[PDB]
From Swiss-Prot, chains A, B, C, D:
Effect of F10S: In sporadic cancers; somatic mutation
Organism field: Homo sapiens (Human)
Impact upon substituting T11I: In a sporadic cancer; somatic mutation
Name recorded for this polypeptide: Cellular tumor antigen p53
Lineage: Eukaryota, Metazoa, Chordata, Craniata, Vertebrata
Impact reported for E28A: In a sporadic cancer; somatic mutation
Annotated phenotype, changing E40K: In a sporadic cancer; somatic mutation
Length: 42, 42, 42, 42
């Protein structure tokens, strides 16, 4: 489904349960932008 | 060394090498604040 | 255009030109998520 | 007090009161790192 070559994946340890949800949130945020980056500007 | 009970640890996958360094940076940032949180206010 | 009552707006000073672009990026990131939050799940 | 030439300052609008506190938090986080960057490594 799109994305031909998969870029190198990485990982990061985040102490704290509530704090973890915060980092993951920013992760999906930027990922959302990159997702619409494949759609023409109009 | 301080920190008696260790809080639950977690992890997060971050695609992209350059992007990874960015997330890790914010991680050490907040961790730096919590580190000085154990020092009296003066 | 949608968004009836405007929520209280705020501001934050960010020293550094390159650093500024970084913060603004995360700003548009979360804003992008909230933008698709008004669209039904399918 | 240290910091001879002040770097160009900037600003960013953040909608949402609770959300604002979140951004400001990351701001002080990186600023805390830069603060210890002036102290020798030991």
């Amino acid at each position: 489904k799109k994305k031909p070559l998969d870029g190198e994946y990485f990982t990061l340890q985040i102490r704290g349960r509530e704090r973890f949800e915060m980092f993951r949130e920013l992760n999906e945020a930027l990922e959302l932008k990159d997702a619409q980056a494949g759609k023409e500007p109009g």
